[PDB]
Design a protein around this ligand. Structure first.
Ligand SMILES: CCCCC1C(=O)N(c2ccccc2)N(c2ccc(O)cc2)C1=O
Ligand SMILES: CCCCC1C(=O)N(c2ccccc2)N(c2ccc(O)cc2)C1=O
Ligand SMILES: CCCCCCCCCCCCCC(=O)O
Ligand SMILES: CCCCCCCCCCCCCC(=O)O
Ligand SMILES: CCCCCCCCCCCCCC(=O)O
Ligand SMILES: CCCCCCCCCCCCCC(=O)O
Ligand SMILES: CCCCCCCCCCCCCC(=O)O
Ligand SMILES: CCCCCCCCCCCCCC(=O)O
Length: 582
């Protein structure tokens, strides 16, 4: 229309508009106090209404980037508090906007946000719902300036719901805590997947991204034509590129356009899009990106038809290599929603290396003829890992299952820090308790999603404090080889045992008064230290000590003079256990 602010305000709503302006300002001006952003928001909202009333009103015709930049350059302590950023105000649009992007701190030095007691939260919530929620929305946004705003708003409403429901509960904590803990992880995962996808698009490039997308979109819309999935991969690639550059306005607009395009060609893409396409502007996109895989066509040919038996394979492949491979991927991915995207990529890479080393052969058709026989082991590796790991997980519980992983990975990389092994193994354990409850056909896609962030977080840490060449080998490896690389690690034999430290295996009754999570991590840490001291120990040998300690802990927390129990019994355990481990 003739007025940008008016337009956005109208088809967004006052509530959503006020929330996004807030998040937008908090992501740039991360150092300003809450009361300061609230003022900006009201001033901007007041302005918007003016434009809604009279489209021709002053400044209402200016662009959003321009207006946003102007108000930004209004902050008087700009230079004093953000130094260099203030010099941005001297530039002219769009150099000004670019300038702001460049000076956005992806991770400032703000104190960790602590979770207050349920009663204080619920009371603060009841006594002033709006400031309570906007204040936190502010704290979150300033700490994650690259987190897509609309996405951040979706989370806020889920938090609003948890309070509404739980603060009315008889037992508030039993209701709230589990919901908050879940919200946090779900949020952290969302954040990580976001940062992960941008980093990938930078290192590996556009080809790999597009490949990843063709596969992913084909599993979802197995009925859409290949030309549609391509049209879509092209636009999706532009969307992410932009959204990754960090410009919110461009990003949002590109996501909107794509969501409308999809909804309009709905019948030509997937049946599962009805619900999503009815929802309001601010959710259409979110819904869609989350949509379930449509049912795949009933009568579908055999891949070997056009890709192994056809006589024009090399002819069609030289014509346009990536198109052909994309086509291969499309046909392969849409017949396998049960495969992880990365697996589909491995098969395509494998099929690619073949056509390259066969279309240059005397008789092509006979050279590549048995290619599908080479997929088998590639497909089975991940399947067997899942079955084998999910079985074990059902035998033991989440907690005990995490201990098994602890022993397993400490042996593979004893050089890694003890608290890093516990963090990683616990998170790994969670992926098992989340994906194993799924029926086989959805397990692999599930593990991939969760495993990708855990492996990324793991690599980041190590990036900072490098400790093993192998981990760096796996971490800097190709995205498609990453997990198989870690799966291929073997017990470290070069490793030299950690010297026995008395303290490290001493325990006081305080563990008794500690919370479930606290006890576990307390035990799990000793478990890692144990394996680092006796790496050549056997599961049996180990299993014995563990269960001994196990009891010793209970048999002392449910005992009279607890401290002596741990002191006297503890002297014994350590003494015997060492004997058992020679
Ligand atoms: C690398 C992480 C990809 C996340 C993602 C996704 O799955 N869809 C997506 C894209 C096409 C079909 C189905 C889902 N879109 C997306 C959704 C809505 C929109 O309007 C713009 C883009 C995405 O950004
Ligand atoms: C008789 C069936 C044995 C199954 C079993 C197993 O594989 N681990 C096990 C034992 C040692 C190393 C790795 C795994 N432990 C176990 C697991 C967690 C725990 O905290 C205590 C013990 C077991 O009890
Ligand atoms: C989304 C913005 C609203 C957040 C309000 C909930 C407060 C809890 C935040 C503390 C984070 C945590 O759970 O560790
Ligand atoms: C003023 C700044 C508000 C701009 C946000 C527009 C919201 C568009 C939603 C796009 C999407 O579906 O992701
Ligand atoms: C238009 C569709 C583009 C997709 C091209 C297919 C290429 C698949 C190769 C497998 C990807 C491995 C990633 C990589 O090594 O770059
Ligand atoms: C603990 C649960 C382990 C999950 C098995 C890993 C399977 C990885 C699937 C992703 C891939 O294909 O690389
Ligand atoms: C540090 C510990 C390394 C983490 C390795 C976990 C990788 C998961 C792949 C599953 C497997 O095959 O074990
Ligand atoms: C070499 C002497 C040190 C032995 C001390 C045993 C400490 C190991 C703790 C094992 C944790 C048990 C976990 C559980 O509760 O199942």
């Amino acid at each position: 229309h003739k007025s940008e602010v008016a337009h956005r305000f109208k088809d967004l709503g006052e509530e959503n508009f006020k929330a996004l302006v807030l998040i937008a300002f908090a992501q740039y001006l991360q150092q300003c106090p809450f009361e300061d952003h609230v003022k900006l928001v009201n001033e901007v909202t007041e302005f918007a209404k003016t434009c809604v009333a009279d489209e021709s009103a002053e400044n209402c015709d200016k662009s959003l980037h321009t207006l946003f930049g102007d108000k930004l350059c209004t902050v008087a302590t700009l230079r004093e508090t953000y130094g260099e950023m203030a010099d941005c105000c001297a530039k002219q649009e769009p150099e000004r906007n670019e300038c702001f992007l460049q000076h956005k701190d992806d991770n400032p030095n703000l104190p960790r946000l602590v979770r207050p007691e349920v009663d204080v939260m619920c009371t603060a919530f009841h006594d002033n719902e709006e400031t309570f929620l906007k204040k936190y929305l502010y704290e979150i946004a300033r700490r994650h300036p690259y987190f897509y705003a609309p996405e951040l708003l979706f989370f806020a409403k889920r938090y609003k719901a948890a309070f509404t429901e739980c603060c009315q509960a008889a037992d508030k904590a039993a209701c709230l805590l589990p919901k908050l803990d879940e919200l946090r992880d779900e949020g952290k995962a969302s954040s990580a997947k976001q940062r992960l996808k941008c980093a990938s698009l930078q290192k590996f490039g556009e080809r790999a991204f597009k490949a990843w997308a063709v596969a992913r979109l084909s599993q979802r819309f197995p009925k859409a034509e290949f030309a549609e999935v391509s049209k879509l991969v092209t636009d999706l690639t532009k969307v992410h590129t932009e959204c990754c550059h960090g410009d919110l306005l461009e990003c949002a607009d590109d996501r909107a356009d794509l969501a409308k395009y999809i909804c309009e060609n709905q019948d030509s893409i997937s049946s599962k899009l009805k619900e999503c396409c009815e929802k309001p502007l601010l959710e259409k996109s979110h819904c869609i990106a989350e949509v379930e895989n449509d049912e795949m066509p009933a009568d579908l040919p055999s891949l070997a038809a056009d890709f192994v038996e056809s006589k024009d394979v090399c002819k069609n492949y030289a014509e346009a290599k990536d198109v052909f491979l994309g086509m291969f991927l499309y046909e392969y991915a849409r017949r396998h929603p049960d495969y992880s995207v990365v697996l589909l990529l491995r098969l395509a890479k494998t099929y690619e290396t073949t056509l390259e080393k066969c279309c240059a052969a005397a008789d092509p058709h006979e050279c590549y003829a048995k290619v599908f026989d080479e997929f088998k082991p590639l497909v089975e590796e991940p399947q067997n890992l899942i079955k084998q790991n999910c079985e074990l997980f059902e035998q033991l519980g989440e907690y005990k299952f995490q201990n098994a992983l602890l022993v397993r990975y400490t042996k593979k990389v004893p050089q890694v820090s003890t608290p890093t092994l516990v963090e990683v193994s616990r998170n790994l354990g969670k992926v098992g308790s989340k994906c194993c409850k799924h029926p086989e056909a959805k397990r692999m896609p599930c593990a991939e999603d969760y495993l990708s962030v855990v492996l990324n977080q793991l690599c980041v840490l190590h990036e900072k404090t490098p400790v093993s060449d192998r981990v760096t080998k796996c971490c800097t490896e190709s995205l498609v080889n990453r997990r198989p690389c870690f799966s291929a690690l073997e017990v470290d034999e070069t490793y030299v045992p950690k010297e026995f430290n008395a303290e490290t295996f001493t325990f006081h009754a305080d563990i008794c008064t500690l919370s479930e999570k606290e006890r576990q991590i307390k035990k799990q840490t000793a478990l890692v230290e144990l394996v680092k001291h006796k790496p050549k120990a056997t599961k049996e040998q180990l299993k014995a000590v563990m269960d001994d300690f196990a009891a010793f802990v209970e048999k002392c927390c449910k005992a009279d003079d607890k401290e002596t129990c741990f002191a006297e019994e503890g002297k014994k355990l350590v003494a015997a256990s060492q004997a058992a481990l020679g």
